[PDB]
CSV table of C-alpha atoms in Angstrom, one decimal:
chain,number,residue,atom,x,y,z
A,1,UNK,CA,22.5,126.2,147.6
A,2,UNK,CA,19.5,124.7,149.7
A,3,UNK,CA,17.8,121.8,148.3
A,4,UNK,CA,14.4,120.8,149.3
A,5,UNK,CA,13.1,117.5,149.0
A,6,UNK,CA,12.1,114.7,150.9
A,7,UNK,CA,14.5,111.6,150.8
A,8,UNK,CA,13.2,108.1,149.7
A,9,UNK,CA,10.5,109.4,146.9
A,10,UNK,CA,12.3,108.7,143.3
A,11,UNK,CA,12.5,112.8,141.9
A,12,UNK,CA,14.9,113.6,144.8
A,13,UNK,CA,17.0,110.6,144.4
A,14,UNK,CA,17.7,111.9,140.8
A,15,UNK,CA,18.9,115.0,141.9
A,16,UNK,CA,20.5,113.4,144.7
A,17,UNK,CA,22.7,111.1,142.1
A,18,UNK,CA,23.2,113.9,139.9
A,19,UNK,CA,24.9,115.4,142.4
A,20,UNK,CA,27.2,112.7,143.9
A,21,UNK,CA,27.8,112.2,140.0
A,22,UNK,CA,29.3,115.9,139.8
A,23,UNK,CA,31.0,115.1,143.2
A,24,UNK,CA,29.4,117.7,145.0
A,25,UNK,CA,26.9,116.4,147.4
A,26,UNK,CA,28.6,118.3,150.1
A,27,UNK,CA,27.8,121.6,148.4
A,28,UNK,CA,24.3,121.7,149.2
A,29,UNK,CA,22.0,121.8,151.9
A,30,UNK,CA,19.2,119.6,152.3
A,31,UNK,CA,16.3,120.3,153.8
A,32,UNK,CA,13.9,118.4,154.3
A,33,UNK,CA,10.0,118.2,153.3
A,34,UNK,CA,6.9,117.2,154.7
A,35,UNK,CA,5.6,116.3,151.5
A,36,UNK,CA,3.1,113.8,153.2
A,37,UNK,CA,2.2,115.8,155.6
A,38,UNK,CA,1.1,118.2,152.9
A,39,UNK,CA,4.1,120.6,153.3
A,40,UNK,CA,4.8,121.2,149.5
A,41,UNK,CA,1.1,122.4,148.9
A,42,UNK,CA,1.3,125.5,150.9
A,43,UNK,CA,1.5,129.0,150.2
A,44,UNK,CA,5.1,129.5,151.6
A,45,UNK,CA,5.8,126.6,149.4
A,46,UNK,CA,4.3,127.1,146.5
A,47,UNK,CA,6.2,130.7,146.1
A,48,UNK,CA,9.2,129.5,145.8
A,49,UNK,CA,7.6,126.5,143.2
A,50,UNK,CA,4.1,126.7,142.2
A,51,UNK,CA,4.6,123.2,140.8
A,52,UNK,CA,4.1,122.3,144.2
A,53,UNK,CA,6.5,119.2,143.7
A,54,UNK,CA,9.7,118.2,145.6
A,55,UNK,CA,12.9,118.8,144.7
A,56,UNK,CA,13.5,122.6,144.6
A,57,UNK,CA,16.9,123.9,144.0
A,58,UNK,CA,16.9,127.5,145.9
A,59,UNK,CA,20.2,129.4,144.8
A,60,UNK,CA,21.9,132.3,147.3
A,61,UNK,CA,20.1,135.0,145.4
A,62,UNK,CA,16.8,133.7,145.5
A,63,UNK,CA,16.4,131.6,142.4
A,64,UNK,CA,14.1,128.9,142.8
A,65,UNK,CA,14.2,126.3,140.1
A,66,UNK,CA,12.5,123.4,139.8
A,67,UNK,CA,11.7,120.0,137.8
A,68,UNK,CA,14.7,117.4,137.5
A,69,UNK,CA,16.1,118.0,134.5
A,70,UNK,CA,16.1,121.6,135.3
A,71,UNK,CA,18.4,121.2,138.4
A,72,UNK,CA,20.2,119.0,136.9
A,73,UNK,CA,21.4,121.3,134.4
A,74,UNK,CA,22.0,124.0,136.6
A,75,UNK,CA,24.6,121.4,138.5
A,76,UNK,CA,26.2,120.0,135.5
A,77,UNK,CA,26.4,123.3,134.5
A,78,UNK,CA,28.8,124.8,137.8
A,79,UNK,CA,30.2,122.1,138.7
A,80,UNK,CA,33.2,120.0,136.9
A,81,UNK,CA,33.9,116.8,135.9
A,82,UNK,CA,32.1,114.9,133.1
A,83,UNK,CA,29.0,116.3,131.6
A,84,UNK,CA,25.4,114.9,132.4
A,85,UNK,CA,23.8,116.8,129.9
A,86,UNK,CA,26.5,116.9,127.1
A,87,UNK,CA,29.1,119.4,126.0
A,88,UNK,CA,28.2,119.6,122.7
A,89,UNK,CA,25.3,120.9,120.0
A,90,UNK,CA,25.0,117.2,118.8
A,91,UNK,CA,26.2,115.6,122.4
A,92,UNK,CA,23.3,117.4,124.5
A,93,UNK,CA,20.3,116.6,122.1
A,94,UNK,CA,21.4,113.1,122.0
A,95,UNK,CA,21.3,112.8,125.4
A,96,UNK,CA,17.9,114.9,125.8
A,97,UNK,CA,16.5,112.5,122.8
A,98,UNK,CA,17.2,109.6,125.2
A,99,UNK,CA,16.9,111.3,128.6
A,100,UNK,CA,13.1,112.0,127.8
A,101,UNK,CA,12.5,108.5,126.5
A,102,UNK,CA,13.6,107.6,130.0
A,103,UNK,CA,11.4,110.4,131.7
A,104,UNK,CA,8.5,109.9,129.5
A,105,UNK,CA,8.6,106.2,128.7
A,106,UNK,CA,9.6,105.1,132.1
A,107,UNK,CA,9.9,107.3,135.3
A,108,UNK,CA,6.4,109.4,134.4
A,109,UNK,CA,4.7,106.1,133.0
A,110,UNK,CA,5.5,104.2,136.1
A,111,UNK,CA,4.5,107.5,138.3
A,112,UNK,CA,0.9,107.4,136.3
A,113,UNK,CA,0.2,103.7,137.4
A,114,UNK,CA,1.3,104.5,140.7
A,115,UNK,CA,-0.8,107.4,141.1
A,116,UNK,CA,-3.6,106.8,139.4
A,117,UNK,CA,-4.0,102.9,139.0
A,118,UNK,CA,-3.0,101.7,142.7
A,119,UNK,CA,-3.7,103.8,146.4
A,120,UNK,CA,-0.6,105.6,145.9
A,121,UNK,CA,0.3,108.0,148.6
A,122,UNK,CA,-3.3,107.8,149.8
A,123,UNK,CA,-6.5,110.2,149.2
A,124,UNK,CA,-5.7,113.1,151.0
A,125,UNK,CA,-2.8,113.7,148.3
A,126,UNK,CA,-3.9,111.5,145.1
A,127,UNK,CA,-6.8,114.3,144.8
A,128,UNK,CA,-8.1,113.2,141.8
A,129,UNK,CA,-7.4,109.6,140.2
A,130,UNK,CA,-8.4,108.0,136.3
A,131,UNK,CA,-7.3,104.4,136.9
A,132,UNK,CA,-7.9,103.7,133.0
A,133,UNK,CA,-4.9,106.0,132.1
A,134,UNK,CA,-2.5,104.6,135.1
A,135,UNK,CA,-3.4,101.2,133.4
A,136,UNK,CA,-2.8,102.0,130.4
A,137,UNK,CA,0.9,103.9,131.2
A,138,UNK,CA,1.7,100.6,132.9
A,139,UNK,CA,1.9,99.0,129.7
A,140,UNK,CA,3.9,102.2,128.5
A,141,UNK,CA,6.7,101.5,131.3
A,142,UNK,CA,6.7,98.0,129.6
A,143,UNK,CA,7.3,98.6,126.3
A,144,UNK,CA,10.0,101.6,127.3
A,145,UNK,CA,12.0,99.1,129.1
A,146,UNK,CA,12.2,96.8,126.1
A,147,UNK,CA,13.4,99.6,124.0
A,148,UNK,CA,15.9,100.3,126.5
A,149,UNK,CA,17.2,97.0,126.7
A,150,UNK,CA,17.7,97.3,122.4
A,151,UNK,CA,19.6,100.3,123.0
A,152,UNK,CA,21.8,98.9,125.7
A,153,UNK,CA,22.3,95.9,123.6
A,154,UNK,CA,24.7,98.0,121.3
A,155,UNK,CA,25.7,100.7,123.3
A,156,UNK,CA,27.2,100.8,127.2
A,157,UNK,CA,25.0,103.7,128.2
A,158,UNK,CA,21.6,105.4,127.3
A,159,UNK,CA,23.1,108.1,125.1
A,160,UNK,CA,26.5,106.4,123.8
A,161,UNK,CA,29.7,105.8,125.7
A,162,UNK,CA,29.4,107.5,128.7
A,163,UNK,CA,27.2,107.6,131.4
A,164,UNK,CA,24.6,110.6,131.5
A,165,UNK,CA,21.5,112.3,132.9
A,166,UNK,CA,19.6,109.7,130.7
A,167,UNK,CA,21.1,106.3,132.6
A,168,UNK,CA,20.1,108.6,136.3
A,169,UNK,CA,16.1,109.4,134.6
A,170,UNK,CA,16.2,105.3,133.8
A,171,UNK,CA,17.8,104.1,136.8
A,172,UNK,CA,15.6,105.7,138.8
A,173,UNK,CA,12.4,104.6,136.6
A,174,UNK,CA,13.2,100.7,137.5
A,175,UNK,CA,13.9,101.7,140.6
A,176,UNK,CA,10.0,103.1,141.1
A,177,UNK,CA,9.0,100.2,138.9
A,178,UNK,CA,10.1,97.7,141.4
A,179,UNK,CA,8.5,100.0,144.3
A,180,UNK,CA,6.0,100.4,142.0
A,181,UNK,CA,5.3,96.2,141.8
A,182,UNK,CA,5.5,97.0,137.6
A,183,UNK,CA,7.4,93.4,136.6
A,184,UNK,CA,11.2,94.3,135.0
A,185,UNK,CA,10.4,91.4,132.2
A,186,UNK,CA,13.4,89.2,133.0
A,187,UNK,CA,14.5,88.3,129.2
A,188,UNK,CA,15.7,91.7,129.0
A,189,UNK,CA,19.2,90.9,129.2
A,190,UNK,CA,21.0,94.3,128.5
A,191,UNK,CA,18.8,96.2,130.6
A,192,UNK,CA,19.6,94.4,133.7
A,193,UNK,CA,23.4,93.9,133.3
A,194,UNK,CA,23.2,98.1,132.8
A,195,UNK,CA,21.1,98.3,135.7
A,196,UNK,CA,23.5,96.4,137.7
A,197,UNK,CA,26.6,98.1,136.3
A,198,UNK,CA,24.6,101.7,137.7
A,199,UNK,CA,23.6,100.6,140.8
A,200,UNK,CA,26.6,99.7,141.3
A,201,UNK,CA,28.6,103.5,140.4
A,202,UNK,CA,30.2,105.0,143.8
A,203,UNK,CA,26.9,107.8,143.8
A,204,UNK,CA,24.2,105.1,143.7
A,205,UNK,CA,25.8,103.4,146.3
B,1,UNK,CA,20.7,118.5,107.7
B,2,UNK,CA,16.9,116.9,106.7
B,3,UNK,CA,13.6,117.9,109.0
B,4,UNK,CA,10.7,115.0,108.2
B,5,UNK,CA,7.8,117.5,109.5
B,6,UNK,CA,4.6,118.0,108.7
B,7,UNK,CA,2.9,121.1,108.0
B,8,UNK,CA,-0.1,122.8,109.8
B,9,UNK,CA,1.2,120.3,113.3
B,10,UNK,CA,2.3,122.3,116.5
B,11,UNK,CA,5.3,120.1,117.0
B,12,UNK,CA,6.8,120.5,114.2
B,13,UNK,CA,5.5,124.8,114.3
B,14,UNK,CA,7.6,124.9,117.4
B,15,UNK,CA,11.4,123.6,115.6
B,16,UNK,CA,10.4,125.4,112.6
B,17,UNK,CA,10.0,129.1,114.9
B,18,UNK,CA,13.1,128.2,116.3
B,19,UNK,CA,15.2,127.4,113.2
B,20,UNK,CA,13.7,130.7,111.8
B,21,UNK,CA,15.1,132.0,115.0
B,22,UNK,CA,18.6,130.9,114.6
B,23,UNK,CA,18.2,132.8,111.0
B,24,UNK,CA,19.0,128.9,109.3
B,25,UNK,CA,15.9,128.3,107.6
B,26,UNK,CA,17.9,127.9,104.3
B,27,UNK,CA,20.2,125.6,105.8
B,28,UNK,CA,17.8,122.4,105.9
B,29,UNK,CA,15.8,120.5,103.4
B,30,UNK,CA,12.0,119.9,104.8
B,31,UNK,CA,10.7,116.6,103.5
B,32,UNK,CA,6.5,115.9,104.3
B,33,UNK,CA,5.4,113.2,106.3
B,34,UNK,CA,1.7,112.1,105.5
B,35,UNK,CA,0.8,111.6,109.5
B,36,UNK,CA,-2.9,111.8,108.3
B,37,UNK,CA,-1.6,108.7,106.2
B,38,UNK,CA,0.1,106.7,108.8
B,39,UNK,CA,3.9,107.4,107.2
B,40,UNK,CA,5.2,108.1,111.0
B,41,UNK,CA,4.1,104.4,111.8
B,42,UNK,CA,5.5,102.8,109.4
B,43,UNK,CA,8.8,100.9,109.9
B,44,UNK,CA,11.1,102.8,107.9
B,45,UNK,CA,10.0,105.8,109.9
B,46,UNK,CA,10.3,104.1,113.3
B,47,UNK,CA,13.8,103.0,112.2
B,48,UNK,CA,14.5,106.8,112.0
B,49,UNK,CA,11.8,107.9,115.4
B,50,UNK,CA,10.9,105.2,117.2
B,51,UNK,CA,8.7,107.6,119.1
B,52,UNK,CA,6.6,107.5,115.9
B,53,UNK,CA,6.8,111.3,115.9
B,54,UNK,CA,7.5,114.4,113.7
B,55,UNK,CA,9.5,116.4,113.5
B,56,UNK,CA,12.9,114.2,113.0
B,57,UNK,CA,16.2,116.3,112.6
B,58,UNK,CA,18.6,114.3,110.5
B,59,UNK,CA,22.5,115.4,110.4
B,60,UNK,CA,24.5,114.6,107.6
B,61,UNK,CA,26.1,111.6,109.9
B,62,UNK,CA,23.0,110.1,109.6
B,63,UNK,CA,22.0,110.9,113.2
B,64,UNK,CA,18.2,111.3,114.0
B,65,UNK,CA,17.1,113.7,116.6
B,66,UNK,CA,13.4,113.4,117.7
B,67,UNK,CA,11.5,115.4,119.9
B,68,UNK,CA,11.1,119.2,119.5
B,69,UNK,CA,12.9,120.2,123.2
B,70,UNK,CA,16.3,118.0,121.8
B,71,UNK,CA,15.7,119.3,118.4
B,72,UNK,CA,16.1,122.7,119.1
B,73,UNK,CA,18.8,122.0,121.5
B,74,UNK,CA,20.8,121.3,118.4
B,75,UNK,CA,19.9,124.4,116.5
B,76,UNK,CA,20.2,126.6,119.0
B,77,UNK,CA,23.8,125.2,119.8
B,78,UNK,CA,25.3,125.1,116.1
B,79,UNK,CA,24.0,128.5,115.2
B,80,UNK,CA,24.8,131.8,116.2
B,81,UNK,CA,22.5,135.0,116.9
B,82,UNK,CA,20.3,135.2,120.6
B,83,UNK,CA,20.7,131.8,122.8
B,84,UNK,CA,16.7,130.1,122.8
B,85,UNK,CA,18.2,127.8,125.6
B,86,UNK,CA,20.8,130.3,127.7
B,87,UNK,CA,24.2,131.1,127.9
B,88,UNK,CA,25.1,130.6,132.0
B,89,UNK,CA,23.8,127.8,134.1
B,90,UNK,CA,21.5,129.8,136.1
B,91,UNK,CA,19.7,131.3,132.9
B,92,UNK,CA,19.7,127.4,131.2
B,93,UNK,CA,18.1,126.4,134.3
B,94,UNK,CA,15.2,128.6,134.5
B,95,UNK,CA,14.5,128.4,130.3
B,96,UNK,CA,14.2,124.7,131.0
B,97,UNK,CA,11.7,125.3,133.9
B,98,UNK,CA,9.9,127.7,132.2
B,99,UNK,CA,9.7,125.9,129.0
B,100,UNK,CA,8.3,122.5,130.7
B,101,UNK,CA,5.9,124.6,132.4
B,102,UNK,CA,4.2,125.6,129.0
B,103,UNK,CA,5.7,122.0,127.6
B,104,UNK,CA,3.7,119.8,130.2
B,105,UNK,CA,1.2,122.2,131.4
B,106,UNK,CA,0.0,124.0,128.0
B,107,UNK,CA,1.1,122.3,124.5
B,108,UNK,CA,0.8,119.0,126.1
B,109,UNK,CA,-2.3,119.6,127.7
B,110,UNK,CA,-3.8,120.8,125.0
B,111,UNK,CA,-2.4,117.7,123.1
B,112,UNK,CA,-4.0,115.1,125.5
B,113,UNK,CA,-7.4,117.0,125.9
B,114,UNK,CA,-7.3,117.1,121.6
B,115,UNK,CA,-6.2,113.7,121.2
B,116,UNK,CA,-8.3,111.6,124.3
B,117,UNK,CA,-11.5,113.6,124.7
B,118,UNK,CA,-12.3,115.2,120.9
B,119,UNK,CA,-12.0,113.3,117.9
B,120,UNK,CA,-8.9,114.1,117.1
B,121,UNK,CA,-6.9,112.9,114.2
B,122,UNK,CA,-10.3,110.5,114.0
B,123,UNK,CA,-10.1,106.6,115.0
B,124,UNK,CA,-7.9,105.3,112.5
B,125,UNK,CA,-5.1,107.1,114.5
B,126,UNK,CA,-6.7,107.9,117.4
B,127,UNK,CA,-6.2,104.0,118.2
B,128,UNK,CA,-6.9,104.5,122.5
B,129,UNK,CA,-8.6,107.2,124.1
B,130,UNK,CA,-9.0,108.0,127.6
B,131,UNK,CA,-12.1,110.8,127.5
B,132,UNK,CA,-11.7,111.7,131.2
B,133,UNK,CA,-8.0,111.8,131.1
B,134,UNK,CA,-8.4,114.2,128.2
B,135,UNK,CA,-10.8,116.6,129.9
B,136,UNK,CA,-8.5,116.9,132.8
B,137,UNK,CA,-5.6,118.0,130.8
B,138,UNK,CA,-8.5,121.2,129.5
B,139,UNK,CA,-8.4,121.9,132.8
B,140,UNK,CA,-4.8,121.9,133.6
B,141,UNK,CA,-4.5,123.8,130.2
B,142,UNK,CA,-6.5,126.3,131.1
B,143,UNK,CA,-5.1,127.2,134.6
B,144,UNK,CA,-1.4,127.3,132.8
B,145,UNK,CA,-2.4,129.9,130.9
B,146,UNK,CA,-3.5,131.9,134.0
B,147,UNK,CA,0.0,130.9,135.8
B,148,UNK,CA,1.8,132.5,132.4
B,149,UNK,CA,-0.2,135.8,132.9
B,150,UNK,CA,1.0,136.1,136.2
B,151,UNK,CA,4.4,135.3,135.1
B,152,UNK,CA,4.5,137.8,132.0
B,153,UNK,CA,2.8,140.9,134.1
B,154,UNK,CA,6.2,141.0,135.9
B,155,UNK,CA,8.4,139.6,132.9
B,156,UNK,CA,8.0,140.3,129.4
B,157,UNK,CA,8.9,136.4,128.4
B,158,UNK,CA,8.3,133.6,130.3
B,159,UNK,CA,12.2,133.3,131.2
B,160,UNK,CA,12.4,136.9,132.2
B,161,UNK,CA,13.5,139.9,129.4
B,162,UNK,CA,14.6,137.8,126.2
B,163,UNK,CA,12.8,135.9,124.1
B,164,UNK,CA,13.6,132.0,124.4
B,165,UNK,CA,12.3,128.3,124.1
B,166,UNK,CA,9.8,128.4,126.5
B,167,UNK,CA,7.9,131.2,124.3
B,168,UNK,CA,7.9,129.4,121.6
B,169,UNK,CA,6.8,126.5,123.5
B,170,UNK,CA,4.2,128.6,124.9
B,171,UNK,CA,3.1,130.4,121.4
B,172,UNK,CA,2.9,126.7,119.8
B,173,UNK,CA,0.4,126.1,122.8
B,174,UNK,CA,-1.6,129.3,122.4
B,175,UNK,CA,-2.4,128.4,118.7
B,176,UNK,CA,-2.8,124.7,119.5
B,177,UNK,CA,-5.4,126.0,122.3
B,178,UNK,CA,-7.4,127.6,119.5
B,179,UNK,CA,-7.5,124.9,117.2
B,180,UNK,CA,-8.7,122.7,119.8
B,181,UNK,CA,-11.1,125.2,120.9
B,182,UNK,CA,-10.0,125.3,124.1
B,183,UNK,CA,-11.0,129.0,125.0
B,184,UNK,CA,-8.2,131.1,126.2
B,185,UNK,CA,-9.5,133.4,129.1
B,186,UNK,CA,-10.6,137.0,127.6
B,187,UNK,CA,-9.2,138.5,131.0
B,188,UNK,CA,-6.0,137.5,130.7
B,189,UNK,CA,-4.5,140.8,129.5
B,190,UNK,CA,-0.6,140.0,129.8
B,191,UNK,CA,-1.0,137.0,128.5
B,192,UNK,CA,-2.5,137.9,125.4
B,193,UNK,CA,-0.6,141.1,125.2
B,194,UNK,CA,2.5,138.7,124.7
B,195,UNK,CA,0.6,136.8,122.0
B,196,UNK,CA,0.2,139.3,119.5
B,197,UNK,CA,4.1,140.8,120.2
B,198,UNK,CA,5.6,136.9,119.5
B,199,UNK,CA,2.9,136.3,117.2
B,200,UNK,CA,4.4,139.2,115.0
B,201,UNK,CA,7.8,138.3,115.1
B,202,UNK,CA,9.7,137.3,112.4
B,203,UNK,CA,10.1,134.1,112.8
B,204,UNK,CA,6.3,134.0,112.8
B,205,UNK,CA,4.5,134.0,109.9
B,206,UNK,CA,1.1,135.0,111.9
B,207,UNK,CA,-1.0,133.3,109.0
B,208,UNK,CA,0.1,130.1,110.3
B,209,UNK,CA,-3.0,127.5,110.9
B,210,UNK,CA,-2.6,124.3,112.4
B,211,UNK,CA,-4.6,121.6,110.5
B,212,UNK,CA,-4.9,117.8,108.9
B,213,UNK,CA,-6.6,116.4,106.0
């Protein structure tokens, strides 16, 4: 198992917690790329994911797969320990329910702002920008994280009981929010006390 | 087990092809929503969705599942017959790679061009629009659809030789293309090819139109 991605931008760290979660970050490879440099939008690239995004999980027979949520199940899948993504008919749609909340709501809202509304990585990689829409998905990550905070109000994680993919998806969402400069609105109690609670879990760490 | 759809929407075309799929069509009640009406906005709906979206599964428990990729999760899991979402890590893996492919890239896309740069659902629900955004998302729309006839001239499905999620995903798309009149490009044989064999499936009525009043 090689994983390509480029350490500090928020889709890797996912994977990257994911991973420590399942207690097998010493299972991979990492390999590093040159995203801003322009590395991921080349041909050689792009064959193994014509996403052209970071990370990639390449498997010993060839298997490229991509997206977050993707790798993730693929690693929650061969490795043991608790489930990320839910062991269960009813378990794993709860946790998809809330784990795309997070990835909608939060982590891609935050992302639009970022990419679109402010210089983000610079011109020679934002190609195109609409600043109207990264405005408006600002307001998006807003209202998200005072949802989340409701939910965590009445439950200890995202999904329930346990901790999930959906708590790693959010985590990393205020994570690129702070980055990001979107304000955390500092009445959300239960939102905060979780995030401390994660940041605090031996893989974040 | 309750599904608050609404028919003639793609969302709620894609969980119906799937329970159809799963052969457990008989197994839930369907009760409307009147989106074109505003019910999904309302606050006994959001109480149920707070996405504000159909379709909403509802288990016996009480339980409300919302969005179509988490929905059919739970069908596909309970009920027996071919796996829409795999049956090893590996083959999970690349049906949820495949599947957001035509999720973000193609029903989505579709969705946002639809919904920012047309009319839409018209401005009492089309409450912000982003026009630009919206024609962006044609674009992105369209060159899915040429990614997927590369994918399917070496692969019957998206996901490789058996039917799954992501063709539903992809079918839902297709249709929701037309509807919007976003043209689908004549040349792309494999592509189409695939149409008309899911199209005729089963599970697929074929008649099926998207529409709102």
């Amino acid at each position: 198992m090689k994983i390509y991605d480029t350490e500090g931008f928020p889709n890797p760290l996912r994977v990257r917690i994911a991973l420590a979660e399942k207690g097998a970050t010493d299972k991979v490879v990492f390999v590093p790329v040159d995203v801003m440099g322009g590395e991921h939008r080349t041909t050689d690239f792009r064959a193994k994911n014509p996403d052209a995004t970071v990370p990639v999980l390449e498997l010993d027979d060839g298997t490229c797969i991509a997206q977050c949520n993707a790798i993730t199940e693929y690693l929650d899948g061969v490795f043991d320990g608790p489930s990320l993504t839910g062991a269960s008919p009813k378990e794993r749609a709860v946790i998809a329910m809330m784990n795309i909340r997070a990835e909608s709501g939060l982590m891609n809202a935050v992302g639009a702002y970022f990419h679109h509304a402010t210089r983000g990585l610079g011109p020679d990689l934002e190609t195109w920008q609409c600043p109207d829409w990264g405005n408006k998905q600002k307001e998006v990550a807003q209202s998200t994280m005072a949802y989340l905070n409701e939910v965590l109000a009445e439950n200890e994680f995202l999904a329930g009981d346990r901790f999930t993919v959906a708590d790693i998806t959010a985590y990393a969402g205020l994570v690129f929010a702070e980055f990001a400069k979107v304000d955390i609105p500092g009445h959300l109690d239960h939102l905060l006390a979780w995030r401390a609670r994660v940041a605090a879990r031996p893989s974040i760490t």
